[PDB]
Amino acid sequence: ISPIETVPVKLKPGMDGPKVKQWPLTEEKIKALVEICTEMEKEGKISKIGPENPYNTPVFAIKKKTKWRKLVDFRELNKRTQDFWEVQLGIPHPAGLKKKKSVTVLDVGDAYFSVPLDEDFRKYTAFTIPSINNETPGIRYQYNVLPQGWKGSPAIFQSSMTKILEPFAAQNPDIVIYQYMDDLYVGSDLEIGQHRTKIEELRQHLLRWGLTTPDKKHQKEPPFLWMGYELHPDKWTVQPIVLPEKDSWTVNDIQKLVGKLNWASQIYPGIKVRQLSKLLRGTKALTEVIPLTEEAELELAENREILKEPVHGVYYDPSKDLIAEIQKQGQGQWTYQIYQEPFKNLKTGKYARMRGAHTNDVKQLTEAVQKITTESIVIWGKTPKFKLPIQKETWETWWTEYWQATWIPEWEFVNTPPLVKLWYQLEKEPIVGAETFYVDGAANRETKLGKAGYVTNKGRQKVVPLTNTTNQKTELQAIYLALQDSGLEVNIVTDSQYALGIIQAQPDKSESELVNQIIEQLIKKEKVYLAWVPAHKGIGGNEQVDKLVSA
Amino acid sequence: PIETVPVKLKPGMDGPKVKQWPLTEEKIKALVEICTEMEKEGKISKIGPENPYNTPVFAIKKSTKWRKLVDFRELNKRTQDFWPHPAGLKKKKSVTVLDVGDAYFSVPLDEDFRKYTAFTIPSINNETPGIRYQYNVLPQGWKGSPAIFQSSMTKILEPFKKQNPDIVIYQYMDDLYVGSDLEIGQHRTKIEELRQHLLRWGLTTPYELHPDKWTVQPIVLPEKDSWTVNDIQKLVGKLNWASQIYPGIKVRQLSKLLRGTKALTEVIPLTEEAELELAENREILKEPVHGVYYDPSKDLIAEIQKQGQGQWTYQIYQEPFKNLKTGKYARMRGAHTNDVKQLTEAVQKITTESIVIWGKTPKFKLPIQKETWETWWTEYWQATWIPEWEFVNTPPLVKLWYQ
Ligand SMILES: C=CC(=O)Nc1cc(Oc2ccccc2OCCn2ccc(=O)[nH]c2=O)c(C)c2cc(C#N)ccc12
Structure with a gap:
């Protein structure tokens, strides 16, 4: 039966066929292999071969607890066969x-x-049915069709189909x-x-x-359970998510937990997984027990509350617009819905990446819009209209002052608190009448001890000692000290490009608590101008704090 | 033309296997029309699953008709060299x-060699397997096409x-x-x-183009009627930055004006020695650098900074602080421009200048998020070549210095 054209297959250059010897089998398995192989030989799928075929591949027979199944171990042949065009790895999304x-x-x-x-290529698929106790030579066979378990079978079958x-179809x-x-x-x-x-x-x-x-009426009727999905005639959803309840948790348990939560987030709005992945931050042995953080406990509890209610998604209509909405979920976490009809979500999603030690709400919102854009191109082949909780003044000011190029889509402002806003803005010009703090910090790179100090134009000077710190952290601590001891308006001069770069980025959330305290201080201020001077150049003001903090 | 030139790959190197990027339905339809007409003309042919190689394809405009652009960067990296650039x-x-x-x-x-030119027209949502072709003729964008055609040219x-x-x-x-x-x-x-x-x-x-007007931009210093402490701090910082490149810059007389602990907004008169020192420093910046020379064996690196108001600075160098070229690019807004359009046009202009001057494309350090550039870079791309690029994630604290 060869109406289908064959695909030319070659072994990897410089490699010969597999010669793995056949493991001895019990008499019953041998009988099953003989009957199965005679049935396949009648059907033309395999053929008996002569003695001069040097290749062999182990064969086996099993029945998972009625029917017998023959299994072949093509690992060696697979290692020796050419690569193929990768069969479809990404499944379509139901939405x-x-x-x-x-x-x-x-x-x-x-x-x-x-x-x-x-x-x-058929000669490289040769296998042997062992005789009883090796009295006589076993039976040699080779495949005429695509073997189950061979490297090339999925791609070649797909092409032929x-x-x-x-x-x-034509x-x-x-x-x-x-x-x-x-x-x-x-x-x-x-x-x-x-x-x-x-x-x-x-x-x-x-x-x-x-x-x-x-042959009969087709055994599969709605709803279709497929790849963790329920496919109904008028809707789709995910199969029921079951989160385990344990006293102790290993790395493996948390990995599977965040896996199931990730899987649920595509239709369940509000799923959060940040604190649990923070538990996975160590990235050690899969059996190591990880203690749950309070934030991770609260996160898992809120996820359990969300998964308590059933949710479903709808299918796509090309004649209707594609719309996406974003809502802030809290500390650096975001959720979004993609829909065409007001309450009929195509799907949902989340975005909780910091991609940096410090960031602000507008940057994260822009990144979330980017992720939604990529996902929309992947799933529907077009970008959606955006309804975002940010005003044109905020976003325009940000993307205008942002040192990095960004692409802002067309979007309408939807007033639904919490709104995205700029919690503070640094001054672009020095402040008249405000005190000028010259700040500096230093740390002994061996003892880890240090100090942070300021000298102002009003004649005020201060030094605060610090334990177990580094020079960069003393620079940030010096800026913080200036913020603490100043009025609502203050000019600050530093020689640290590190601290200058952190503050100029204007973050509103950070991984370090020191930068968070600086952020709170900045929010409580009215006007703050930050200036930079090269260190050890005797500028004036900077030299006094350098000599003060060095002594 | 029956005799084909035998083409090889570098020893111990297999063909390209690059991921095809997802595209909108518009670009996919355009690629299907283009590739159908190219297939009727014998330029490309469909391939089977025994071909594991892949090269990305894109649809651009360059006119209102769609054009097909193939990203042969990997295949070009893996292709044999062939047996000059006029200064x-x-x-x-x-x-x-x-x-x-x-x-x-x-x-x-x-x-x-045709199997190595394989490419894929992707489907939406991975619903169907992509439409796979290989080239039967010399394709545009492959470094072997001008080499094989060189004699005819x-x-x-x-x-x-x-x-x-x-x-x-x-x-x-x-x-x-x-x-x-x-x-x-x-x-x-x-x-x-x-x-x-x-x-x-x-x-x-x-x-x-008019390369007769191209030059390395000189460092410019401010001119003010009244200087504040902050202004002098900025000037001393900038002159200190430029002292790494130009040796003769002095800041002693300028920094002397700030001795003490003064408020930032205090007006400071320019004394005679500080004004003469600033003037001398202006004269020093008029000259070009001493020992910067091009190395054909090393990579060209291009850095870009967003200056606001449609202005973008850039530097082409091979070693740090050894700028082979510097420049500033501008674009009239017209309410139809954006950051990505300006950055794309800037990249194409810088690449063109690099081709004219040194005969090869530079390696770009782009101030943009990776996925944004990967999403929108084809909307304004008009060139037929594609340079290498990476994405910086640190803000230039030197934007003001190249400004
Ligand atoms: C992500 C891909 C995906 O889900 N692919 C699938 C598509 C599909 O049917 C369609 C076939 C051709 C065009 C559209 C189809 O469905 C449109 C939506 N839909 C779905 C169900 C239904 O009853 N009615 C209805 O309109 C069926 C029956 C599938 C069955 C299995 C099983 N097992 C697995 C996947 C299936």
């Missing part, structure tokens, strides 16, 4: 499908065994045919009767090419 | 760039070069660079003569 009036699942029976294998479907443009592994998914808007007729036509075509489909 | 091209008064890539579609590609250009000995012609990838010192009308007339000469010999050619 990208268009609602169909009639829908059908066709499971292809014995898919791989229905496609012929390249002739010149595509070429087989091309004519039928004669039926009103029928949508998807292929995935050994499954076909057929959809149409025709009448249910003539839809069944078209399904029967496709079944007869595939059968003419040697591919069997569900 | 006088940058001295010419006018240089015009002509697209001669269509000619490459007249030459067949080595049959054993020399043969076609030989008469025109004979008539015009003082006109410089340098080829880079799909582009011909034609430079002359003639008047602009004479120059454009010669360009049209070359165009018609190429056309009547079957070389279809469906942007003129």
